[PDB]
Structure 1
Amino acid sequence: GFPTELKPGTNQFLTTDDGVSAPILPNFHPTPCIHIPGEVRNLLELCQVETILEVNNVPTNATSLMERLRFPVSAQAGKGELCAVFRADPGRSGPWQSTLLGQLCGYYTQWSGSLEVTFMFTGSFMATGKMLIAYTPPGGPLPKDRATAMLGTHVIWDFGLQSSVTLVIPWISNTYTTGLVSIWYQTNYVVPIGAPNTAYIIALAAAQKNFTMQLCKDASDIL
């Protein structure tokens, strides 16, 4: 005796619709949840941890995939040009896919935030030298030389600092779509005798607190 009209879209089964249904076992009491030290509530927590950045995404051989992680600095090249880290776009394919951030960005379509990229020099203790890291905003092309690269956003990195040098890129968006950071030889690799003339440096990258993702999409290769 209670008036009710069935409005359009009744017996539809929408996958994303958040409703409640009858319990298959309405007396079964699940084992009470104890404490387990590590917990995750938001994926951004993972997006904010530093993960190895495969800037050296050149080798492909199965016995040389470990070369991907680190890229070399040597006495060979002087005041030239080291390596151009892929554009500031953790979602797009490339080096950023080695990061946990990158793989997570593959599970979403839109993202916006600031990213931190700390570089870790692993040469000898007696080795010194100066590298010039410089980030150039999107639209504008890759700086042709170091001096021209210096006139923009740049960071002088001396090996008086082992790893503490870390670039903070302002903003990342989705529609040179995204800006690229380049690493330059400001100064030739200089060592004493008995010290190796070639050294490798590891890049580590994460996202800052202000980083977020929005529209979700399941794009995984397997399976």
Structure 2
Amino acid sequence: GIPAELRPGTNQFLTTDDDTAAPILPGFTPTPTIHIPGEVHSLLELCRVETILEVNNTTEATGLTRLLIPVSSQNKADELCAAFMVDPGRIGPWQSTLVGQICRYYTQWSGSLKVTFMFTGSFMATGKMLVAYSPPGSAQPANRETAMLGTHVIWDFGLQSSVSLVIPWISNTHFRTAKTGGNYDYYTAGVVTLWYQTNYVVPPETPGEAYIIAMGAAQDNFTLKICKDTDEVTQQAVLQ
């Protein structure tokens, strides 16, 4: 017998503990592996894929016209098309994408984001848009002169029917808690607004109403810290 004292932490079952355990089956060899395509190694591979945002999540949108930003022709200039927050750990459009369901498993995120707008309309319909990201501060801008003071991009519907606005990492702290609201408005990321830059011009005998499909993903420097459990799953009784 070797002398040995017992310390605090004895006989406890820590959930996230890395320790050995007695094997039930001695001298066991499992089934040999084969080559299955599409092996994942990290959750940062699932965050870098584009995924349609629910920017039209307002009421009166029925079942599948919640993914579409309606575009038409205006009468006044400098109009606005859509606006949505940047926070992916927040309730809204980012709740319907894939990076906003992985950053909800983790209670912290960092790095740049990326929003890709695809125009689904007629081939003869031209136009221009001013999608602009605005760091925190005041509320959503009211004019286009205030919106163009941030980090905008001028995208025109041409042969290439998709532009991508990268959202840079402009923060004071290294990380941001994916839980905003209350005293957690210190970790807000800003507002992305999309403006009717010039107009939506259409020739005769062509529909004057189109749609834009917004998609979102992470960037190369995206990272996450401290796992947690999501707030979606609700269960009253066991699934018998």
Decide whether the 8 Å contact of 2:119 with 2:162 is kept in 1: no
Measure the CA separation in 2 of the matches of 1:42 and 1:194: 51
Shift of 1:28: 2.6
The corresponding residue for 2:47 is: 47
The corresponding residue for 2:165 is: 167
Structure 1 residue runs of 4 or more that deviate by more than 6 Å after TM superposition:
none
Q: Deviations over 1:196-216 (max 9, x none)?
A: 100001001100011111111
The corresponding residue for 2:142 is: 144
Q: Is 1:90 aligned to 2:88, yes or no?
A: yes
Decide whether the 8 Å contact of 1:71 with 1:202 is kept in 2: yes
In structure 1, list runs of 5 or more residues that go unmatched. Answer: none
Decide whether the 8 Å contact of 1:132 with 1:186 is kept in 2: yes
- Whichever residue aligns with residue 94 of structure 1, its letter is G
Partner-residue secondary structure (3-state), 2:131: strand
Shift of the 150–3 alpha-carbon distance from structure 1 to 2, 3 Å rule, reads same
- RMSD of aligned C-alpha atoms? 1.7
Measure the CA separation in 2 of the matches of 1:192 and 1:99: 35
Measure the CA separation in 2 of the matches of 1:161 and 1:222: 46
Give runs of aligned pairs for residues 128-139 of structure 1, distance below 5 A: 128-139=126-137
Shift of the 52–139 alpha-carbon distance from structure 1 to 2, 3 Å rule, reads same
The corresponding residue for 2:80 is: 81
Partner-residue secondary structure (3-state), 1:65: coil
Decide whether the 8 Å contact of 1:132 with 1:184 is kept in 2: yes
Partner-residue secondary structure (3-state), 1:82: strand
- Whichever residue aligns with residue 100 of structure 1, its letter is L
Shift of 1:113: 1.3
Give runs of aligned pairs for residues 53-202 of structure 1, distance below 5 A: 53-59=53-59, 64-76=62-74, 78-79=76-77, 80-85=79-84, 87-160=85-158, 162-171=160-169, 173-174=176-177, 177-202=188-213
- Whichever residue aligns with residue 81 of structure 2, its letter is L
Shift of the 193–114 alpha-carbon distance from structure 1 to 2, 3 Å rule, reads same
